Amino acid sequence: PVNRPRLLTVKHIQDVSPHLRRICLTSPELADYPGGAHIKIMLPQPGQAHAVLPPSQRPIMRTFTIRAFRREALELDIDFALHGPASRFANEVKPGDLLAISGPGLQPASHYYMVGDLTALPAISAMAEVMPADARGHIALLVPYQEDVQDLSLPAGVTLRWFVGSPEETAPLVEYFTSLPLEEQQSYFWFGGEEGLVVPMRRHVRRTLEVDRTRVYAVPYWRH
Amino acid sequence: PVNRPRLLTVKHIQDVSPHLRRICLTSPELADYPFGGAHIKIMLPQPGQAHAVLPDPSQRPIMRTFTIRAFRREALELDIDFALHGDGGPASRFANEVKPGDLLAISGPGPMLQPASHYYMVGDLTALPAISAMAEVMPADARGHIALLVPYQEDVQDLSLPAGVTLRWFVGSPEETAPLVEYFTSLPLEEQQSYFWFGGEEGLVVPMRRHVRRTLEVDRTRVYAVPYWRHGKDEEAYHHARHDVMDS
Numbered sequence: 001p002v003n004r005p006r007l008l009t010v011k012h013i014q015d016v017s018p019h020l021r022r023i024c025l026t027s028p029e030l031a032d033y034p035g036g037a038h039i040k041i042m043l044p045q046p047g048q049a050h051a052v053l054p055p056s057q058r059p060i061m062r063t064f065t066i067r068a069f070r071r072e073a074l075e076l077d078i079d080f081a082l083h084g085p086a087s088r089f090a091n092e093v094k095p096g097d098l099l100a101i102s103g104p105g106l107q108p109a110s111h112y113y114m115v116g117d118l119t120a121l122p123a124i125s126a127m128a129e130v131m132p133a134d135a136r137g138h139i140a141l142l143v144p145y146q147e148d149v150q151d152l153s154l155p156a157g158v159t160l161r162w163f164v165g166s167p168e169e170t171a172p173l174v175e176y177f178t179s180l181p182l183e184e185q186q187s188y189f190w191f192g193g194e195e196g197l198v199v200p201m202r203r204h205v206r207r208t209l210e211v212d213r214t215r216v217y218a219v220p221y222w223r224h
Numbered sequence: 225p226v227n228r229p230r231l232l233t234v235k236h237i238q239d240v241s242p243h244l245r246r247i248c249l250t251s252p253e254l255a256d257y258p259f260g261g262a263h264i265k266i267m268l269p270q271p272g273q274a275h276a277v278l279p280d281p282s283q284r285p286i287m288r289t290f291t292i293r294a295f296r297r298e299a300l301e302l303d304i305d306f307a308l309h310g311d312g313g314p315a316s317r318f319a320n321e322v323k324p325g326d327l328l329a330i331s332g333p334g335p336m337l338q339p340a341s342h343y344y345m346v347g348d349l350t351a352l353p354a355i356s357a358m359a360e361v362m363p364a365d366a367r368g369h370i371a372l373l374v375p376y377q378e379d380v381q382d383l384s385l386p387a388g389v390t391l392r393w394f395v396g397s398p399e400e401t402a403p404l405v406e407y408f409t410s411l412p413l414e415e416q417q418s419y420f421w422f423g424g425e426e427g428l429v430v431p432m433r434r435h436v437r438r439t440l441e442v443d444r445t446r447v448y449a450v451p452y453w454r455h456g457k458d459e460e461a462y463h464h465a466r467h468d469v470m471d472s
């Protein structure tokens with residue numbers, strides 16, 4: 001069973017940003033683990049010592065991004081957008097703690113248009129690491145604090161602009177992204193994160209432009 | 225059965241170069257297909273069959289090995305790139321005659337790009353889909369050298385690579401390997417934290433693997449040396465020769 005749930009150990013923790021914590025996880029069971037995919041982390045219910053994997057004892061599940069996966073080092077990285085059960089795991093985390101995770105569930109283009117918040121930053125960073133060096137386009141990020149503006153190495157022709165504001169101030173960013181000229185041929189639209197970012201941009205793209213099913217990734221990561 | 229053979233249909237065809245044909249295959253059976261550019265077996269009908277008979281051993285299909293060039297789960301699409309030629313064989317016939325709506329049976333995958341700081345890769349058009357698939361997931365600071373042998377100047381194509389990876393194209397027939405081999409043996413190679421990948425025709429893979437075995441000491445796990453085919457021999461004549469090359 002190569003997609004089974006696995007119990008992994010926190011190797012080390014790191015705060016790349018004030019509200020972005022990178023937790024490294026390890027286990028010999030990573031050797032046959034199946035780019036930037038999403039997993040479900042499985043947390044114990046209140047009262048349980050640990051997640052009960054396989055029915056009223058089932059764990060609480062949240063969806064997250066595989067930030068990085070190093071098979072040879074038996075290591076898997078998950079970045080937590082600090083702010084629920086997942087947030088209390090991310091705050092109280094200590095090395096040695098258990099986290100159960102599920103199995104996993106970027107397109108070639110000339111133009112990349114992306115928008116996200118801090119819950120979409122790991123997906124964007126992972127995608128940046130394998131982005132084609134000649135890529136063109138624009139990335140817009142809405143962070144809650146000016147001190148979570150952080151460095152993100154990009155291809156030379158991709159633009160990056162930060163927007164500091166609360167999840168409700170989807171207004172400077174959305175205006176700016178609706179203003180920019182967008183290519184509808186040989187392009188990839190990636191919208192992730194909060195409720196009020198994915199959907200304004202997704203109707204913006206299927207209003208002003210004719211692009212196909214396959215080249216619009218608009219997935220709300222949560223709902224305020 | 226997540227690795228069962230699946231019968232796919234051709235969605236569309238595309239010539240990325242005159243002798244490299246990207247066939248895009250689709251099926252709702254691709255939804256649970258496992259996740260770099262792995263190998264697969266394609267199953268073609270025998271001479272007396274109208275179509276492949278998926279698993280009476282008299283109805284076993286002919287098998288060829290090919291690379292998954294790209295795979296898009298959401299779109300239910302899988303890309304295989306065929307090195308066009310005119311020396312015959314069932315896979316060549318499938319690629320030449322291919323129309324949208326044609327069928328192709330495929331196996332499951334049998335990791336390709338290994339973590340390293342230096343990458344040294346050689347191949348021909350049969351290895352270009354694997355090398356392309358591996359190149360587009362290399363880190364931006366990866367380094368190394370890639371040399372390709374193609375039969376015609378028009379089959380040279382863009383492969384965007386990390387800035388630190390050299391790319392050098394050699395035009396010639398599969399007999400004419402000596403310029404490529406001279407050039408690649410002239411390059412200084414890192415023996416630590418490196419991955420060597422040799423694929424394509426036998427007369428590229430074997431001299432390069434021997435060069436690496438003579439002038440450096442690299443563990444076997446950091447050298448890929450798989451001859452994809454052999455000039456003048458069909459897969460039926462070559463299957464066990466190829467096994468004896470790889471286990472040598």
Ligand SMILES: Cc1cc2nc3c(=O)[nH]c(=O)nc-3n(C[C@H](O)[C@H](O)[C@H](O)COP(=O)(O)OP(=O)(O)OC[C@H]3O[C@@H](n4cnc5c(N)ncnc54)[C@H](O)[C@@H]3O)c2cc1C
Binds near residue numbers: 120
């Ligand atoms: C495919 C996918 C990948 C994701 N990857 C990541 C990832 O790598 N890192 C990551 O941090 N998140 C990621 N998310 C988002 C993640 O699901 C949310 O952070 C999750 O809702 C928070 O879990 P929780 O148990 O702390 O909160 P929940 O109990 O689920 O939500 C409770 C409340 O928290 C509030 N809230 C305040 N700030 C936030 C916030 N930043 N995120 C969520 N809720 C918030 C909301 O009002 C919500 O109603 C991803 C989501 C998807 C769909």
Ligand SMILES: Cc1cc2nc3c(=O)[nH]c(=O)nc-3n(C[C@H](O)[C@H](O)[C@H](O)COP(=O)(O)OP(=O)(O)OC[C@H]3O[C@@H](n4cnc5c(N)ncnc54)[C@H](O)[C@@H]3O)c2cc1C
Binds near residue numbers: 263313349
């Ligand atoms: C791991 C692996 C991955 C491979 N991936 C690919 C891939 O992605 N794409 C791909 O095109 N091939 C790939 N190959 C090679 C492919 O299996 C051979 O080209 C195979 O011989 C093609 O079968 P055929 O039926 O067309 O020709 P066959 O019936 O095997 O042979 C007929 C004749 O044509 C010659 N010949 C065979 N193939 C070629 C060719 N490509 N160019 C010129 N002459 C040829 C033979 O030497 C023989 O004389 C791969 C091989 C391996 C081992």
